[PDB]
PDB file of C-alpha atoms and ligand atoms in Angstrom:
ATOM      1  CA  UNK A   1      -0.806  50.853 -35.114  1.00  0.00           C
ATOM      2  CA  UNK A   2       2.529  49.496 -34.861  1.00  0.00           C
ATOM      3  CA  UNK A   3       2.039  46.097 -36.006  1.00  0.00           C
ATOM      4  CA  UNK A   4       0.953  47.327 -39.541  1.00  0.00           C
ATOM      5  CA  UNK A   5       3.810  49.632 -39.334  1.00  0.00           C
ATOM      6  CA  UNK A   6       6.391  47.047 -39.263  1.00  0.00           C
ATOM      7  CA  UNK A   7       6.610  44.749 -42.781  1.00  0.00           C
ATOM      8  CA  UNK A   8       6.941  48.504 -44.426  1.00  0.00           C
ATOM      9  CA  UNK A   9       9.314  49.568 -41.778  1.00  0.00           C
ATOM     10  CA  UNK A  10      11.632  46.382 -41.885  1.00  0.00           C
ATOM     11  CA  UNK A  11      12.151  46.889 -45.739  1.00  0.00           C
ATOM     12  CA  UNK A  12      12.916  50.307 -45.929  1.00  0.00           C
ATOM     13  CA  UNK A  13      14.923  49.889 -42.555  1.00  0.00           C
ATOM     14  CA  UNK A  14      17.697  48.130 -45.516  1.00  0.00           C
ATOM     15  CA  UNK A  15      18.617  51.634 -46.523  1.00  0.00           C
ATOM     16  CA  UNK A  16      17.097  54.127 -44.803  1.00  0.00           C
ATOM     17  CA  UNK A  17      18.395  54.947 -41.224  1.00  0.00           C
ATOM     18  CA  UNK A  18      15.479  56.637 -40.029  1.00  0.00           C
ATOM     19  CA  UNK A  19      13.058  53.941 -40.884  1.00  0.00           C
ATOM     20  CA  UNK A  20      15.499  51.878 -38.776  1.00  0.00           C
ATOM     21  CA  UNK A  21      14.941  53.999 -35.724  1.00  0.00           C
ATOM     22  CA  UNK A  22      11.588  53.842 -36.038  1.00  0.00           C
ATOM     23  CA  UNK A  23      11.709  50.414 -36.532  1.00  0.00           C
ATOM     24  CA  UNK A  24      12.624  49.924 -33.376  1.00  0.00           C
ATOM     25  CA  UNK A  25      10.826  52.263 -31.777  1.00  0.00           C
ATOM     26  CA  UNK A  26       7.954  50.049 -32.413  1.00  0.00           C
ATOM     27  CA  UNK A  27       9.346  47.505 -29.693  1.00  0.00           C
ATOM     28  CA  UNK A  28       9.393  46.749 -25.849  1.00  0.00           C
ATOM     29  CA  UNK A  29      13.200  47.275 -24.379  1.00  0.00           C
ATOM     30  CA  UNK A  30      12.233  43.340 -23.517  1.00  0.00           C
ATOM     31  CA  UNK A  31      11.061  42.399 -27.076  1.00  0.00           C
ATOM     32  CA  UNK A  32      10.730  38.295 -26.982  1.00  0.00           C
ATOM     33  CA  UNK A  33      11.459  36.932 -30.387  1.00  0.00           C
ATOM     34  CA  UNK A  34      11.581  33.635 -31.808  1.00  0.00           C
ATOM     35  CA  UNK A  35      12.343  32.545 -34.958  1.00  0.00           C
ATOM     36  CA  UNK A  36      11.501  28.968 -35.981  1.00  0.00           C
ATOM     37  CA  UNK A  37      11.372  28.137 -32.248  1.00  0.00           C
ATOM     38  CA  UNK A  38      14.379  29.607 -31.133  1.00  0.00           C
ATOM     39  CA  UNK A  39      13.669  32.594 -28.596  1.00  0.00           C
ATOM     40  CA  UNK A  40      15.914  35.637 -28.442  1.00  0.00           C
ATOM     41  CA  UNK A  41      15.294  38.379 -25.970  1.00  0.00           C
ATOM     42  CA  UNK A  42      15.944  42.102 -26.224  1.00  0.00           C
ATOM     43  CA  UNK A  43      16.719  45.089 -28.343  1.00  0.00           C
ATOM     44  CA  UNK A  44      20.538  44.838 -28.881  1.00  0.00           C
ATOM     45  CA  UNK A  45      19.487  41.028 -29.862  1.00  0.00           C
ATOM     46  CA  UNK A  46      16.446  42.434 -31.938  1.00  0.00           C
ATOM     47  CA  UNK A  47      19.426  44.791 -33.547  1.00  0.00           C
ATOM     48  CA  UNK A  48      21.415  42.339 -34.537  1.00  0.00           C
ATOM     49  CA  UNK A  49      19.169  40.193 -36.492  1.00  0.00           C
ATOM     50  CA  UNK A  50      17.709  43.341 -38.076  1.00  0.00           C
ATOM     51  CA  UNK A  51      21.217  44.099 -39.235  1.00  0.00           C
ATOM     52  CA  UNK A  52      22.108  40.575 -39.982  1.00  0.00           C
ATOM     53  CA  UNK A  53      19.019  40.097 -42.708  1.00  0.00           C
ATOM     54  CA  UNK A  54      20.231  43.244 -44.277  1.00  0.00           C
ATOM     55  CA  UNK A  55      24.044  42.221 -44.679  1.00  0.00           C
ATOM     56  CA  UNK A  56      22.600  38.346 -45.839  1.00  0.00           C
ATOM     57  CA  UNK A  57      20.538  39.962 -48.829  1.00  0.00           C
ATOM     58  CA  UNK A  58      20.825  42.771 -51.225  1.00  0.00           C
ATOM     59  CA  UNK A  59      16.675  42.765 -51.346  1.00  0.00           C
ATOM     60  CA  UNK A  60      14.086  41.703 -49.701  1.00  0.00           C
ATOM     61  CA  UNK A  61      10.171  42.524 -49.442  1.00  0.00           C
ATOM     62  CA  UNK A  62       7.535  41.535 -47.182  1.00  0.00           C
ATOM     63  CA  UNK A  63       3.659  41.563 -47.785  1.00  0.00           C
ATOM     64  CA  UNK A  64       1.025  40.293 -45.049  1.00  0.00           C
ATOM     65  CA  UNK A  65      -2.361  39.497 -45.001  1.00  0.00           C
ATOM     66  CA  UNK A  66      -3.210  41.341 -41.817  1.00  0.00           C
ATOM     67  CA  UNK A  67      -3.299  40.972 -37.847  1.00  0.00           C
ATOM     68  CA  UNK A  68      -6.265  38.922 -36.927  1.00  0.00           C
ATOM     69  CA  UNK A  69      -7.071  37.742 -33.708  1.00  0.00           C
ATOM     70  CA  UNK A  70      -5.223  34.262 -33.261  1.00  0.00           C
ATOM     71  CA  UNK A  71      -7.064  31.137 -32.681  1.00  0.00           C
ATOM     72  CA  UNK A  72      -6.069  30.422 -29.195  1.00  0.00           C
ATOM     73  CA  UNK A  73      -4.187  32.692 -26.507  1.00  0.00           C
ATOM     74  CA  UNK A  74      -3.973  36.479 -26.051  1.00  0.00           C
ATOM     75  CA  UNK A  75      -1.835  37.198 -29.654  1.00  0.00           C
ATOM     76  CA  UNK A  76      -2.753  38.362 -33.038  1.00  0.00           C
ATOM     77  CA  UNK A  77      -1.301  37.070 -35.860  1.00  0.00           C
ATOM     78  CA  UNK A  78      -0.617  37.486 -40.045  1.00  0.00           C
ATOM     79  CA  UNK A  79       0.051  35.193 -42.732  1.00  0.00           C
ATOM     80  CA  UNK A  80       3.205  36.452 -44.467  1.00  0.00           C
ATOM     81  CA  UNK A  81       4.618  36.182 -47.615  1.00  0.00           C
ATOM     82  CA  UNK A  82       8.741  37.221 -48.818  1.00  0.00           C
ATOM     83  CA  UNK A  83      10.501  37.748 -51.485  1.00  0.00           C
ATOM     84  CA  UNK A  84      14.671  38.506 -51.407  1.00  0.00           C
ATOM     85  CA  UNK A  85      17.743  38.499 -53.494  1.00  0.00           C
ATOM     86  CA  UNK A  86      20.567  37.105 -51.677  1.00  0.00           C
ATOM     87  CA  UNK A  87      24.060  38.863 -51.182  1.00  0.00           C
ATOM     88  CA  UNK A  88      25.214  36.183 -53.325  1.00  0.00           C
ATOM     89  CA  UNK A  89      22.914  36.849 -56.272  1.00  0.00           C
ATOM     90  CA  UNK A  90      20.533  34.398 -55.627  1.00  0.00           C
ATOM     91  CA  UNK A  91      16.591  34.857 -55.450  1.00  0.00           C
ATOM     92  CA  UNK A  92      13.954  33.184 -52.822  1.00  0.00           C
ATOM     93  CA  UNK A  93      10.639  32.965 -51.478  1.00  0.00           C
ATOM     94  CA  UNK A  94       9.547  32.132 -48.052  1.00  0.00           C
ATOM     95  CA  UNK A  95       5.961  32.001 -46.490  1.00  0.00           C
ATOM     96  CA  UNK A  96       4.588  31.600 -43.116  1.00  0.00           C
ATOM     97  CA  UNK A  97       3.015  33.091 -39.977  1.00  0.00           C
ATOM     98  CA  UNK A  98       3.952  35.611 -37.435  1.00  0.00           C
ATOM     99  CA  UNK A  99       2.190  35.628 -33.934  1.00  0.00           C
ATOM    100  CA  UNK A 100       2.492  39.054 -31.821  1.00  0.00           C
ATOM    101  CA  UNK A 101       1.451  40.559 -28.448  1.00  0.00           C
ATOM    102  CA  UNK A 102       1.359  44.452 -27.365  1.00  0.00           C
ATOM    103  CA  UNK A 103       1.650  45.876 -24.283  1.00  0.00           C
ATOM    104  CA  UNK A 104      -0.552  48.647 -22.971  1.00  0.00           C
ATOM    105  CA  UNK A 105       1.336  51.065 -24.669  1.00  0.00           C
ATOM    106  CA  UNK A 106       0.908  49.546 -28.099  1.00  0.00           C
ATOM    107  CA  UNK A 107       4.765  48.323 -28.239  1.00  0.00           C
ATOM    108  CA  UNK A 108       5.812  45.235 -29.519  1.00  0.00           C
ATOM    109  CA  UNK A 109       6.684  42.876 -26.778  1.00  0.00           C
ATOM    110  CA  UNK A 110       6.417  39.546 -28.393  1.00  0.00           C
ATOM    111  CA  UNK A 111       6.998  38.601 -32.231  1.00  0.00           C
ATOM    112  CA  UNK A 112       7.308  34.703 -33.570  1.00  0.00           C
ATOM    113  CA  UNK A 113       8.158  34.212 -36.799  1.00  0.00           C
ATOM    114  CA  UNK A 114       7.093  30.595 -38.152  1.00  0.00           C
ATOM    115  CA  UNK A 115       8.189  29.368 -41.599  1.00  0.00           C
ATOM    116  CA  UNK A 116       5.835  27.277 -43.164  1.00  0.00           C
ATOM    117  CA  UNK A 117       7.365  23.282 -43.904  1.00  0.00           C
ATOM    118  CA  UNK A 118       8.553  23.471 -47.719  1.00  0.00           C
ATOM    119  CA  UNK A 119       6.994  21.552 -50.716  1.00  0.00           C
ATOM    120  CA  UNK A 120       9.988  21.794 -53.498  1.00  0.00           C
ATOM    121  CA  UNK A 121      10.477  18.130 -53.939  1.00  0.00           C
ATOM    122  CA  UNK A 122       7.614  16.892 -55.971  1.00  0.00           C
ATOM    123  CA  UNK A 123       8.167  13.210 -56.675  1.00  0.00           C
TER     124      UNK A 123
ATOM    125  CA  UNK B   1      19.658  45.725 -71.443  1.00  0.00           C
ATOM    126  CA  UNK B   2      15.570  45.384 -72.621  1.00  0.00           C
ATOM    127  CA  UNK B   3      15.659  42.025 -70.289  1.00  0.00           C
ATOM    128  CA  UNK B   4      17.394  43.931 -67.210  1.00  0.00           C
ATOM    129  CA  UNK B   5      14.410  46.410 -67.609  1.00  0.00           C
ATOM    130  CA  UNK B   6      11.504  43.967 -67.372  1.00  0.00           C
ATOM    131  CA  UNK B   7      10.946  43.183 -64.092  1.00  0.00           C
ATOM    132  CA  UNK B   8      11.032  46.486 -62.336  1.00  0.00           C
ATOM    133  CA  UNK B   9       9.456  47.954 -65.234  1.00  0.00           C
ATOM    134  CA  UNK B  10       6.537  44.964 -64.676  1.00  0.00           C
ATOM    135  CA  UNK B  11       6.133  46.175 -61.035  1.00  0.00           C
ATOM    136  CA  UNK B  12       6.130  49.908 -61.553  1.00  0.00           C
ATOM    137  CA  UNK B  13       3.670  49.499 -64.354  1.00  0.00           C
ATOM    138  CA  UNK B  14       0.949  48.414 -61.561  1.00  0.00           C
ATOM    139  CA  UNK B  15       0.816  52.098 -60.652  1.00  0.00           C
ATOM    140  CA  UNK B  16       2.879  54.135 -63.310  1.00  0.00           C
ATOM    141  CA  UNK B  17       1.253  54.810 -66.945  1.00  0.00           C
ATOM    142  CA  UNK B  18       4.792  55.745 -67.830  1.00  0.00           C
ATOM    143  CA  UNK B  19       6.013  52.603 -66.759  1.00  0.00           C
ATOM    144  CA  UNK B  20       3.521  50.510 -68.582  1.00  0.00           C
ATOM    145  CA  UNK B  21       4.226  52.216 -71.835  1.00  0.00           C
ATOM    146  CA  UNK B  22       8.343  51.662 -71.332  1.00  0.00           C
ATOM    147  CA  UNK B  23       7.039  47.754 -70.368  1.00  0.00           C
ATOM    148  CA  UNK B  24       5.111  47.370 -73.898  1.00  0.00           C
ATOM    149  CA  UNK B  25       8.339  48.904 -75.734  1.00  0.00           C
ATOM    150  CA  UNK B  26      10.476  46.289 -74.829  1.00  0.00           C
ATOM    151  CA  UNK B  27       8.556  43.952 -76.845  1.00  0.00           C
ATOM    152  CA  UNK B  28       8.202  42.586 -80.478  1.00  0.00           C
ATOM    153  CA  UNK B  29       4.944  43.088 -82.031  1.00  0.00           C
ATOM    154  CA  UNK B  30       5.907  38.959 -82.715  1.00  0.00           C
ATOM    155  CA  UNK B  31       5.843  38.326 -79.215  1.00  0.00           C
ATOM    156  CA  UNK B  32       5.241  34.796 -78.501  1.00  0.00           C
ATOM    157  CA  UNK B  33       4.663  34.240 -74.738  1.00  0.00           C
ATOM    158  CA  UNK B  34       3.584  31.159 -72.356  1.00  0.00           C
ATOM    159  CA  UNK B  35       2.021  31.218 -69.015  1.00  0.00           C
ATOM    160  CA  UNK B  36       0.953  28.111 -67.247  1.00  0.00           C
ATOM    161  CA  UNK B  37       2.396  26.256 -70.254  1.00  0.00           C
ATOM    162  CA  UNK B  38      -0.362  27.892 -72.616  1.00  0.00           C
ATOM    163  CA  UNK B  39       0.691  29.739 -75.153  1.00  0.00           C
ATOM    164  CA  UNK B  40      -0.358  33.541 -76.858  1.00  0.00           C
ATOM    165  CA  UNK B  41       0.733  35.351 -79.245  1.00  0.00           C
ATOM    166  CA  UNK B  42       0.945  39.676 -80.270  1.00  0.00           C
ATOM    167  CA  UNK B  43       1.200  42.734 -78.339  1.00  0.00           C
ATOM    168  CA  UNK B  44      -1.867  42.921 -77.471  1.00  0.00           C
ATOM    169  CA  UNK B  45      -2.542  39.806 -75.765  1.00  0.00           C
ATOM    170  CA  UNK B  46       0.549  40.607 -73.646  1.00  0.00           C
ATOM    171  CA  UNK B  47      -1.188  44.209 -72.519  1.00  0.00           C
ATOM    172  CA  UNK B  48      -4.391  42.087 -71.496  1.00  0.00           C
ATOM    173  CA  UNK B  49      -2.212  40.047 -69.906  1.00  0.00           C
ATOM    174  CA  UNK B  50      -0.120  42.638 -67.699  1.00  0.00           C
ATOM    175  CA  UNK B  51      -3.589  44.516 -67.469  1.00  0.00           C
ATOM    176  CA  UNK B  52      -5.087  41.659 -65.417  1.00  0.00           C
ATOM    177  CA  UNK B  53      -2.006  40.706 -63.281  1.00  0.00           C
ATOM    178  CA  UNK B  54      -2.830  44.415 -61.437  1.00  0.00           C
ATOM    179  CA  UNK B  55      -6.308  43.829 -61.317  1.00  0.00           C
ATOM    180  CA  UNK B  56      -6.062  40.424 -59.682  1.00  0.00           C
ATOM    181  CA  UNK B  57      -3.768  41.665 -57.570  1.00  0.00           C
ATOM    182  CA  UNK B  58      -3.186  44.664 -54.943  1.00  0.00           C
ATOM    183  CA  UNK B  59       0.549  44.728 -55.126  1.00  0.00           C
ATOM    184  CA  UNK B  60       3.357  42.457 -56.805  1.00  0.00           C
ATOM    185  CA  UNK B  61       6.959  42.140 -56.478  1.00  0.00           C
ATOM    186  CA  UNK B  62       9.516  40.458 -58.563  1.00  0.00           C
ATOM    187  CA  UNK B  63      13.182  39.569 -57.999  1.00  0.00           C
ATOM    188  CA  UNK B  64      15.661  38.117 -60.171  1.00  0.00           C
ATOM    189  CA  UNK B  65      18.629  36.509 -60.013  1.00  0.00           C
ATOM    190  CA  UNK B  66      20.293  37.516 -63.518  1.00  0.00           C
ATOM    191  CA  UNK B  67      20.004  36.554 -67.051  1.00  0.00           C
ATOM    192  CA  UNK B  68      22.141  34.069 -68.147  1.00  0.00           C
ATOM    193  CA  UNK B  69      22.753  31.863 -71.572  1.00  0.00           C
ATOM    194  CA  UNK B  70      20.483  28.910 -71.516  1.00  0.00           C
ATOM    195  CA  UNK B  71      22.011  25.374 -71.729  1.00  0.00           C
ATOM    196  CA  UNK B  72      20.808  24.982 -75.349  1.00  0.00           C
ATOM    197  CA  UNK B  73      19.346  27.125 -77.854  1.00  0.00           C
ATOM    198  CA  UNK B  74      19.331  30.797 -78.563  1.00  0.00           C
ATOM    199  CA  UNK B  75      17.711  32.377 -75.271  1.00  0.00           C
ATOM    200  CA  UNK B  76      18.753  33.376 -72.226  1.00  0.00           C
ATOM    201  CA  UNK B  77      17.065  32.814 -68.668  1.00  0.00           C
ATOM    202  CA  UNK B  78      16.675  34.065 -65.316  1.00  0.00           C
ATOM    203  CA  UNK B  79      15.482  32.627 -61.797  1.00  0.00           C
ATOM    204  CA  UNK B  80      13.068  34.679 -60.373  1.00  0.00           C
ATOM    205  CA  UNK B  81      11.004  35.104 -56.582  1.00  0.00           C
ATOM    206  CA  UNK B  82       7.317  36.795 -56.532  1.00  0.00           C
ATOM    207  CA  UNK B  83       5.587  38.222 -54.114  1.00  0.00           C
ATOM    208  CA  UNK B  84       2.585  39.307 -53.831  1.00  0.00           C
ATOM    209  CA  UNK B  85      -0.916  40.301 -51.831  1.00  0.00           C
ATOM    210  CA  UNK B  86      -4.194  39.061 -54.221  1.00  0.00           C
ATOM    211  CA  UNK B  87      -7.097  41.460 -54.614  1.00  0.00           C
ATOM    212  CA  UNK B  88      -8.785  39.692 -51.583  1.00  0.00           C
ATOM    213  CA  UNK B  89      -6.111  40.614 -49.184  1.00  0.00           C
ATOM    214  CA  UNK B  90      -4.356  37.298 -49.459  1.00  0.00           C
ATOM    215  CA  UNK B  91      -0.541  36.914 -49.841  1.00  0.00           C
ATOM    216  CA  UNK B  92       1.465  34.244 -51.912  1.00  0.00           C
ATOM    217  CA  UNK B  93       4.944  33.585 -53.132  1.00  0.00           C
ATOM    218  CA  UNK B  94       6.190  31.841 -56.110  1.00  0.00           C
ATOM    219  CA  UNK B  95       9.196  30.843 -57.816  1.00  0.00           C
ATOM    220  CA  UNK B  96      10.472  29.722 -61.076  1.00  0.00           C
ATOM    221  CA  UNK B  97      12.284  30.423 -64.311  1.00  0.00           C
ATOM    222  CA  UNK B  98      11.761  32.628 -67.212  1.00  0.00           C
ATOM    223  CA  UNK B  99      13.034  32.176 -70.608  1.00  0.00           C
ATOM    224  CA  UNK B 100      13.762  34.751 -73.152  1.00  0.00           C
ATOM    225  CA  UNK B 101      14.436  35.353 -77.138  1.00  0.00           C
ATOM    226  CA  UNK B 102      15.759  38.762 -78.487  1.00  0.00           C
ATOM    227  CA  UNK B 103      15.209  39.432 -82.135  1.00  0.00           C
ATOM    228  CA  UNK B 104      17.911  40.702 -84.174  1.00  0.00           C
ATOM    229  CA  UNK B 105      16.816  44.091 -82.714  1.00  0.00           C
ATOM    230  CA  UNK B 106      16.879  43.679 -79.272  1.00  0.00           C
ATOM    231  CA  UNK B 107      13.463  43.298 -78.794  1.00  0.00           C
ATOM    232  CA  UNK B 108      11.704  40.531 -76.756  1.00  0.00           C
ATOM    233  CA  UNK B 109      10.495  38.108 -79.300  1.00  0.00           C
ATOM    234  CA  UNK B 110       9.381  34.860 -76.458  1.00  0.00           C
ATOM    235  CA  UNK B 111       8.932  34.503 -73.419  1.00  0.00           C
ATOM    236  CA  UNK B 112       8.278  31.487 -71.619  1.00  0.00           C
ATOM    237  CA  UNK B 113       7.345  31.693 -67.690  1.00  0.00           C
ATOM    238  CA  UNK B 114       7.562  28.491 -65.870  1.00  0.00           C
ATOM    239  CA  UNK B 115       6.767  27.950 -62.363  1.00  0.00           C
ATOM    240  CA  UNK B 116       8.380  25.771 -60.193  1.00  0.00           C
ATOM    241  CA  UNK B 117       7.241  22.198 -60.008  1.00  0.00           C
ATOM    242  CA  UNK B 118       6.423  22.233 -56.326  1.00  0.00           C
TER     243      UNK B 118
HETATM  244 CL1  LIG C 201      -7.734  43.851 -48.093  1.00  0.00          CL
END
């Protein structure tokens, strides 16, 4: 399924030309994507966003729990886990949820990324 | 360097016995290692730990910043980032620091894994 191919293609697209092409193929040209509430539209914007992630990081890895029906609405969602290494050498992780909708052709037409609130501070 | 080979060997060891054997080769038989603030000793205990990580998880990936000298003592340390998928399907992340000591022969003789105080 397109949603199940997404994360591995995203990670492979950092270094792989064909994987990048396949990654873009998962999406409708009119994809609406949201990053912590900020909405973006279209394939040009999407390609620019993916390319930005790859220039920002020397390495990145995504793991996901599995796409399940959202409690409310017509969407599917999954928990995800990210680890990476910045272009500056430092490392990081992130946890969150992605929420998505497919069209009748099975292409991704909506994809929202919601990073969790963090709890690094302990005092 | 043995410490620079550690992380990628660790991850590759989940699916390749040659990587596991190379990983084990980095260590002194006198390895003292610390997990969750609890100390263990010896290569047998070390092998059992690595094997447990791979039964506990379907997948695991480690990223590290780079091994640098510690503020005090003769150890080296690195920040690390881990993401994984549990045997139960759930996913997780963790951040922390590893602190290591090499013996005179360059083998890992002390390794403390120190997850962040979150
Ligand atoms: Cl599973």
